[PDB]
Amino acid sequence: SMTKTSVDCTMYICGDSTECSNLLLQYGSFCTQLKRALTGIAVEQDKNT
Amino acid sequence: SMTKTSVDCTMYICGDSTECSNLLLQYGSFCTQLKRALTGIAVEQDKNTQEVFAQVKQIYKTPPIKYFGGFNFSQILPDPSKPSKRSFIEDLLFNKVTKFKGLTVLPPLLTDEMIAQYTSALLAGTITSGWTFGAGAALQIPFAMQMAYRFNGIGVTQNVLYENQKLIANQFNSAIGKIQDSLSSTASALGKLQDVVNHNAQALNTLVKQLSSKFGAISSVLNDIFSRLDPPEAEVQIDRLITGRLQSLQTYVTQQLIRAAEIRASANLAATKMSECVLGQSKRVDFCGKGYHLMSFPQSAPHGVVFLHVTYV
Amino acid sequence: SANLAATKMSECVLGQSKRVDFCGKGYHLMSFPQSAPHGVVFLHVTYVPAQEKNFTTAPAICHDGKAHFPREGVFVSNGTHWFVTQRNFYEPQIITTDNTFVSGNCDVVIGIVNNTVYDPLQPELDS
Amino acid sequence: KCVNFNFNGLKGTGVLTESNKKFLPFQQFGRDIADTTDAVRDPQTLEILDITPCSFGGVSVITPGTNTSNQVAVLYQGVNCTEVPNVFQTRAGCLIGAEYVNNSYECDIPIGAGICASYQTSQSIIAYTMSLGAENSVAYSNNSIAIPTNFTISVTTEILPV
Amino acid sequence: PLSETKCTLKSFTVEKGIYQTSNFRVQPTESIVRFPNITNLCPFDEVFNATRFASVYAWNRKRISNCVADYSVLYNLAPFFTFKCYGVSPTKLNDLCFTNVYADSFVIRGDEVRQIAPGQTGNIADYNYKLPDDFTGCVIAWNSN
Known part of the structure; x- marks a missing residue:
């Protein structure tokens, strides 16, 4: 196995401001597949147990 | 195998407007690398379906009169009366598995x-x-001496084989009747068949949802960018939409190469147990199933091969 | 793929392998891997049987009322006398006490054909 | 006919067919999961009509090399050849420029959905279904066994990169 | 199709094999342009064909909304004569609907129809009804005796 980390949509992109959270929906759904790919690794890290 | 989808450079990028196709030439051609990679994908599913599904170039025929000594082999053999040629288990594999x-x-x-x-x-x-x-x-070897080659590899004296032959006849064909009753009710055993097709279904659904996304511009429609405002100031608006679509396409092509790599590495092991415990006796432990190995029965399924492993427990 | 190619360097070259359709189709004999730019070229000698002939067989031989079972090979006959040979080649020999071992009786096996057993001790006693 | 759309709020292309769907009198255009506009409400007379676009796709050229033959075949994949303008209709598509052979031999060039292409001999390209090879039958008899009296062995080669 | 495979692959010696080259498409020869019917018609009978109206000082505003205006049948059939229009063509007038429309009913003389214009001075222009320079519309005048 290897070291498991996760990167969210909000805190890594934005510095906690109002306008940066407004522009998260302007490029659309592109951080929603960041969660299901990294938890898809977490299925496969659980599969190798 | 997997469901093969191929995007196109013309109709997918452009909204059927003549100013979209003229502005594809100032990127050079980025979709000619998309064509030779996806046809390089499409020769790899023409590759691994040749050796795995066909090991030999000749066809052997079952005899029409069957007395096997109390052994029912007819449930895994296909039916000539039905005009589609399929067996009894493979009819249950077709219907439960479902721009x-x-x-x-x-x-x-x-x-x-x-x-x-x-x-x-x-x-x-x-x-x-x-x-x-x-x-x-x-060679023509009947089934009582086909077992005697396989039990000599695991070192079994044949005195238990001929005496208990009527006693192991009832428990052999009921074990396929256990997995016939299991696949008629529980659909959770087919989850390793259907895990490739729904991930490719949501890969198509993640090609859907960015066409309503504005990509930082005013609107996602290419018609009202050129028509409503000044094409001096629409030139900033147009060229990051196609750049915003091709950055969604370049993470689309890398996730479909690793799904081509995950069916490359799994068909290495699928052709390994087709080589070992199908064509002959495999002497290893915990590859072809848990126990001392006897027989391995492949079945037909979409996007995978369902195996039936007979083990000694 | 070079993990697959070094496994043919480890199994098919350096030692013996009982697995089939890895080192070539059928039973492997001798491997000779060769040098190439950006690749390796394997030369594998494989065992393919060609011309076959049917025979007439029995699973066991009944003698005194106790069945005798084979260890190596299978039983063959040409229609006259019963012989013991292997599966890959036809080598007829008469049955002895070395080739057969007594286990069980004759009634518990279906299709047993009786024949007498020639021991080496009975010509040794009178001669 | 494949037309061009000019409406108040709707632009695009498609072929207008009939629609059995239940509609609202207020609405404008209906949508698609496929993210497509599949319907429109006519404002003058109240009805909806089903919008589907017509057939598009890529082409596939079946050809040999330049030192053999110049004969080619035109393949429209997934497209019926009635609405498009040696005609044989298969599952992958309608292939134009090839002849059907009921006999099945070995081949080389793949097409798709169970048919194959090969160049055979007054010489023209043909299209037929891919053969499984020669057939032989093994009888079942409990009292017989086949053992070889002769073996002919050879060299089987395999080449893999590193 | 032999040199279709040769030009897209960019090699003068083509390998024998199946290849995907270009895409096919069909061009539409007719664009269907469809407009609604009369539907909710705007009250243009009250501002045009009615009996008596107000004076040039006494003029009333009427804001006409939530209907479909018909501009083009007064110009095309034309019982009414004179229009001279600046900044917006009648066809373009048809083209950019404005969230609002105003209609003021008055009557003037025949030397005073020249005086109603942006950027002029006069009798009706200075002392009664003045058009600004940015005004987006134009004067239709006719004789009814």
């Missing part, structure tokens, strides 16, 4: 009718021909 913008589905060179007659001759080799059908030219 206009330029997204098309390329069919392979093998339909679902003739996969079951690749496996009809290969299960005829395990019954009539024994271990010698993939060894070159086969």
Whole structure:
């Protein structure tokens, strides 16, 4: 196995401001597949147990 | 295998406008690398379906009169009376497993009718021909001496084989009747069949939802960018939409290469147990199933091969 | 793929392998891997049988009322006398006490054909 | 006919067919999961009509090399050849420029959905279904066994990169 | 199709094999342009064909909304004569609907129809009804005796 980390949509992109959270929906759904790919690794890290 | 989808450079990027196709030439051509990679994908599913589904170039035929000594082999053999050629288990595998913008589905060179007659001759080799059908030219060995080659590899004296032969006849054919009753009720055992197709279904659904996304511009429609405002100031608006679409396409092509790599590495092991414990006796532990190995029965399924492993517990 | 190619360097070259359709189709004999730029070229000699002939067989031989079972090979006959040979080649020999071992009786096996057993001790006693 | 759309709020292309769907009198255009506009409400007379676009796709050229033959075949994949303008209709599509052979031999060039292409001999390209090879039958008899009296062995080669 | 495979692959010696080259498409020869019917018609009978109206000082505003205006049948059939229009063509007038429309009913003389114009001075222009320079519309005048 290897070291498991996760990167969210909000805190890594934005510095906690109002306008940066407004522009998260302007490029659309592109951080929603960041969660299901990294938890898809977490299925496969659980599969190798 | 997997569902093959191929995007196109013209209809998918452009909204059927003549100013979109003229502005594809100032990127050079980025979709000619998308065409030779996806046809380089499409020769790899033309590669691994050749050796795995067809091990040998010849077809063996089952005899029409069947008395096996109390052994029912007819439930894994296909039915000539039905005009589609399929067996009883493979009918249960078909029914439980279930665009206009330029997204098309390329069919392979093998339909679902003739996969079951690749496996009809290969299960005829395990019954009539024994271990010698993939060894070159086969021999006629009947089933009482096909077991005696396999029990000598694990070191079993044959005195238990001929005496208990009527006693192991009832427990052999009921074990396929256990997995016939299991696949008629529990659909959770087919989850390793259907995990490739729903991830490719949501890969198509993640080609849907960015066409309503504005990509930082005013609107996602290419018609009202050029028509409503000044094409001096629409030139900033247009060229990051196609750059915003091709950054969604370049993470689309890298996730479909690793799904091509995950069916590359799994078909290494799928052709390993087709080589070891199908064509002959495999002497290893916990690959072809948990125990001392006896027989391995492949079946026809979409996008995978369902195996039936007979083990000694 | 070079993990697959070094496994043919480890199994098919350096030692013996009982697995089939890895080192070539059928039983492997001798491997000779060769040098190439950006690749390796394997030369594998494989065992393919060609011309076959049917025979007439029995699973066991009944003698005194106790069945005798084979260890190596299977039983063959040409229609006259019963012989013991292997599966890959036809080598007829008469049955002895070395080739057969007594286990069980004759009634518990279906299709047993009786024949007498020639021991080496009975010509040794009178001669 | 494949037309060009000019409406108040709707632009695009498609072929207008009939629609059995239940509609609202207020509405404008209906949508698609496929993210497509599949319907429109006519404002003058109240009805909806089903919008589907017509057939598009890529082409596939079946050809040999330049030192053999110049004969080619035109393949429309997934497209019926009635609405498009040696005609044989298969599952992958309608292939134009090839003849159907009921006999099945070995081949080389794949097409798809169970048919194959080969160049055979007054010489023209043909299209037929891919053969499984020669057939032989093994009888079942409990009292017989086949053992070889002769063996002919050879060299089987395999080449893999590193 | 032999040199279709040769030009897209960019090699003068083509390998024998199946290749995907270009895409096919069909061009539409007719664009269907469809407009609604009369539907909710705007009250243009009250501002045009009615009996008596107000004076040039006494003029009333009417804001006409939530209907479909018909501009083009008064110009095309034309019982009414004179229009001279600046900044917006009648066809373009048809083209950019404005969230609002105003209609003021008055009557003037025949030397005073020249005086109603943006950027001029005069009798009706200075002392009664003045058009600004940015005004987006134009004067239709006719004789009814």
